[PDB]
Amino acid sequence: PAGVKSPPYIFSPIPFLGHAIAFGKSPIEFLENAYEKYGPVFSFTMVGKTFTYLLGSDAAALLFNSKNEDLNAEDVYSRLTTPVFGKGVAYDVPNPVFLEQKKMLKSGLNIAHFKQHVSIIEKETKEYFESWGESGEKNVFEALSELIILTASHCLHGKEIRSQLNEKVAQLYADLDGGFSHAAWLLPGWLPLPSFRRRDRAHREIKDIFYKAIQKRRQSQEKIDDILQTLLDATYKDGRPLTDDEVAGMLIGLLLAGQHTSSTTSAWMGFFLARDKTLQKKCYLEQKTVCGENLPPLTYDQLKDLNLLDRCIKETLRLRPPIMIMMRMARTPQTVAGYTIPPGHQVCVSPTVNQRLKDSWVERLDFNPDRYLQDNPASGEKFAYVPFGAGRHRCIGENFAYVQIKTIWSTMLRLYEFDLIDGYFPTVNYTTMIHTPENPVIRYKRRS
Amino acid sequence: PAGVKSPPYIFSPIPFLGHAIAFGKSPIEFLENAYEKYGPVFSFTMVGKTFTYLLGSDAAALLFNSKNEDLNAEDVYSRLTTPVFGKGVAYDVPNPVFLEQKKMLKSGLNIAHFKQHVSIIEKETKEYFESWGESGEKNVFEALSELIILTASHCLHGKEIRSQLNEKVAQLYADLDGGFSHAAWLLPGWLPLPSFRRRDRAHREIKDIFYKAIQKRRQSQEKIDDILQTLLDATYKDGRPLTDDEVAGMLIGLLLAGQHTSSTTSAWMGFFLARDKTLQKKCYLEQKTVCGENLPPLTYDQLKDLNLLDRCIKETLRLRPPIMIMMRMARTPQTVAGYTIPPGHQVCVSPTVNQRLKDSWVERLDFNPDRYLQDNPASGEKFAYVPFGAGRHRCIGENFAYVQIKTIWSTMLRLYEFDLIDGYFPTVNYTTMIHTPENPVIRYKRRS
Ligand SMILES: OC[C@H]1O[C@@H]2O[C@H]3[C@H](O)[C@@H](O)[C@@H](O[C@H]4[C@H](O)[C@@H](O)[C@@H](O[C@H]5[C@H](O)[C@@H](O)[C@@H](O[C@H]6[C@H](O)[C@@H](O)[C@@H](O[C@H]7[C@H](O)[C@@H](O)[C@@H](O[C@H]8[C@H](O)[C@@H](O)[C@@H](O[C@H]1[C@H](O)[C@H]2O)O[C@@H]8CO)O[C@@H]7CO)O[C@@H]6CO)O[C@@H]5CO)O[C@@H]4CO)O[C@@H]3CO
Ligand code: HEM
Ligand code: HEM
């Protein structure tokens, strides 16, 4: 015991902003260079706050094993940066409660339901891309996100709600999250802020569609077995059932939480595959090898066996995780790689950086889905590959994501063959709140 | 292994000087406050250089056990700050050689010679203070240093040289060291500096008195057994004898090295004793108890048994060591209390601070020579009480010092009884190069 034995602090010559600019410009590069000079654990200032980063699996442990009362999640957010769910749900309530609601939702996303989803997803994907004609050059990112709002609406909300979803309602979801929770690092909690009228309005409006549908279901009670159901049935350790709000709130939250994350990932995979033409063909041939030369309507059980397409996703998520930082506020001193983190610091982990770390991953920057066949830190280490989180803090909708993407990409990979427009592989765009692919226009043509 | 894992660095708002002012104003206080905030090992800037301090016995170890090629002694000095010896001796030569010359000198300061000294010292002390009359108020510091130049000249140089020492020659010794080596911390090596004409002159002049006397001895070779002799006889692991210069150089060096150190200490003890009147009387009664009621001419063997007077010195040296910093330059990385000291840093230890450390010494700031009877860090720990240095780096003339002081103080304690002028206990004066007692005028009267 001595006093100051905290992690090395990187100084900035810019009094308040600190490193906010360098980080804002290119965070992964920033964080890598920092690792090289200061090791696995270090502090620095951005926009008045002190951040302490945990790099590599060993140190990343502290966050992944933490309890929300030592390393706090709600503390990280502003009225603006709070992830959108609803009143009385998620960040609007105490953690223990939020945890319970995630439980309820998790039990909703099960093998039973997934089986129903696969065919819905495939039908939607099939119908959507019909409008793409025989060939052309179009924005896959924009397509994929326009689609995923349909597919995920259907699977997670049920056909009553999905039927009500015209492009006027789709437009309202766009209003809902401008992606702000990804920007929490930049905007500190203390800033004065006006009401976000556009958001609060669309929420009110969308929430109202849910009331109308929670109505219809609670009346005629037939054989409908969807996520919506699971929820209505569910109750707390209370015994108390979910109010109508809670139901809509956590369902809206759920769709959003998965919306951008998925389209990012989907588009990126699309380009990786379009760049390595061999690999693309290969998991197209695996479509026949596994599913059968005639290409039947898709099933959940085939998905379990599309092992290349599975590694292509896994590998996409390694090089392009849609959630770049996981972030918690120190409320009680913590010990990591020798150091003590004083309460006050925002403790952070970067999926992107851990998954790319120069002394763990061979060929760090390479899109090689075969790497998971040899040895790798994915299995080798506890927390080197953590795109969905890890320990106590893992994404509830991990599995649905794999269902949704795999289906969509299969279906897509069937209808079309893809490649880059002029050898142009899309560059990362840090300028959107959630990192998007720069100019994601893709060339496609009918497959044979 | 990570890169930056050096001791905590204390920042200063003054670009070059850094802490030179705060330290210059009151170094012990500075260093204590630093220990409280940063622990036993910490860095800071003074006058362009980086100093790393080792506080407490555990860390102080690194310096005391070091080798001059890892932690360098010559690197610490300027042409100005170099301790004065002579050409071809001490800092003017490589360390191994200097070490050999210290050896030669150490074997000179032995039990045989000490026995001769005691009576010389006592005679000198007796003769000197005769001019003080029956009572008055006079400067003991000025007296003690005027005297010690006589006593130590006699003992260390021999009566040939001591006879030549009139106040014109005494004045030349004053010219020799203005005490500058104590200021090394303040004046860095890189400064442009003119020749120190006054010094170089007095050295030349004093050195010349030595030639005349090395002459006389090397001629008629009779029964004279003094330190001077030991030297002339001595030779290196070479077999090579000491040149005439080397002899004068190391003898001059020797006298100076002990000159100020001793008078500081003597004066301080004088005031400690003058403030605690009980204690003074007590070791005056111990003068009879041990030496005999009639008070014979003093002998070496009685000195060995004046155990209170011995602890009063020991205790004086604890609270007022004349050498405040021991200082070495890192030439190869070193490890202390977890940390790595990069080559470049001036690694430092403070006798004063170690000997006062708040969590080792009970009653830290108290003049209580009895503390060495109970438990204490003096014996308790390896390097808590290190006024003469320790490990490989210990003062060769430690013993002679105890002889000289003990004798002088005995003799003094006999002739007179002392006390403070108006309850005024002299305050430390950091403004002289070597820390002196502020306004060291003392009241004395004949003893009975
Ligand atoms: O003890 C303090 C400090 O010690 C640790 O820092 C270590 C670090 O790991 C190493 O890198 C190295 O430090 C060197 C550093 O790397 C070099 O860059 C350089 O540092 C210079 C800066 O680059 C430069 O910007 C400038 O600093 C100015 C600041 O920009 C400016 O903000 C202000 O300083 C005040 C600060 O505003 C404020 O933060 C406050 O600082 C305290 C911190 O809150 C706190 O983190 C801690 O700092 C530790 C740190 O945790 C360790 O990692 O205590 C701080 C007080 O010490 O107060 C400041 C008031 O001055 O203005 C300054 C200019 O004065 O200059 C510096 C250097 O001149 O050089 C560094 C060494 O030369 O080693 C250390 C080992 O301790
Ligand atoms: C595209 C791949 C996805 C990735 C990489 C991803 C990543 C993450 C991460 C890192 C977390 C935070 C874990 C924590 O700190 O507790 C998280 C939380 C969450 N995920 Fe995902 N996710 C993805 C898709 C989805 C999908 C499809 C859904 C919906 C079915 C979903 C629903 C949620 C919800 C409700 C949370 C909690 C939200 C919060 O606490 O703010 N995710 N996700
Ligand atoms: C009054 C009490 C004294 C104290 C507290 C004291 C303290 C010290 C210290 C701390 C050192 C440095 C040790 C090292 O780093 O190697 C030293 C060196 C030395 N001492 Fe003393 N000393 C005292 C008296 C004397 C006396 C009386 C003599 C002469 C007989 C003497 C001769 C020397 C010499 C020649 C050196 C080496 C000088 C150098 O390396 O610069 N000292 N002393």
UniProtKB/Swiss-Prot annotation, chains A, B:
Membrane topology qualifier: Single-pass membrane protein
UniProt entry keywords in alphabetical sequence: Cholesterol biosynthesis, Cholesterol metabolism, Endoplasmic reticulum, Heme, Iron, Lipid biosynthesis, Lipid metabolism, Membrane, Metal-binding, Microsome, Monooxygenase, Oxidoreductase, Steroid biosynthesis, Steroid metabolism, Sterol biosynthesis, Sterol metabolism, Transmembrane, Transmembrane helix, Ubl conjugation
Tissues where the protein occurs: Ubiquitously expressed with highest levels in testis, ovary, adrenal, prostate, liver, kidney and lung.
Gene Ontology biological process: cholesterol biosynthetic process; cholesterol biosynthetic process via 24,25-dihydrolanosterol; negative regulation of amyloid-beta clearance; negative regulation of protein catabolic process; negative regulation of protein secretion; steroid biosynthetic process; sterol metabolic process
Post-translational note: Ubiquitinated by MARCHF6, leading to proteasomal degradation.
Pathway assigned in UniProt: Steroid biosynthesis; zymosterol biosynthesis; zymosterol from lanosterol: step 1/6
EC number: 1.14.14.154
A Pfam family recorded for this sequence: p450
Keyword Iron: yes
GO molecular function: heme binding; iron ion binding; oxidoreductase activity; oxidoreductase activity, acting on paired donors, with incorporation or reduction of molecular oxygen, reduced flavin or flavoprotein as one donor, and incorporation of one atom of oxygen; sterol 14-demethylase activity
Cellular localization per UniProt: Endoplasmic reticulum membrane; Microsome membrane
Activity regulation as described: Inhibited by azalanstat. Inhibited by azole antifungal agents ketoconazole, itraconazole and fluconazole.
Record-listed heme binding positions: C395
Cofactor: heme
GO CC annotations, alphabetized: endoplasmic reticulum membrane; membrane
Cross-referenced CDD domains: CYP51-like (cd11042)
Gene3D superfamilies reported in the protein's UniProt record: Cytochrome P450
Task of the protein: Sterol 14alpha-demethylase that plays a critical role in the cholesterol biosynthesis pathway, being cholesterol the major sterol component in mammalian membranes as well as a precursor for bile acid and steroid hormone synthesis.
Family (UniProt): Belongs to the cytochrome P450 family.
Record's protein name: Lanosterol 14-alpha demethylase
Organism: Homo sapiens (Human)
Lineage: Eukaryota, Metazoa, Chordata, Craniata, Vertebrata
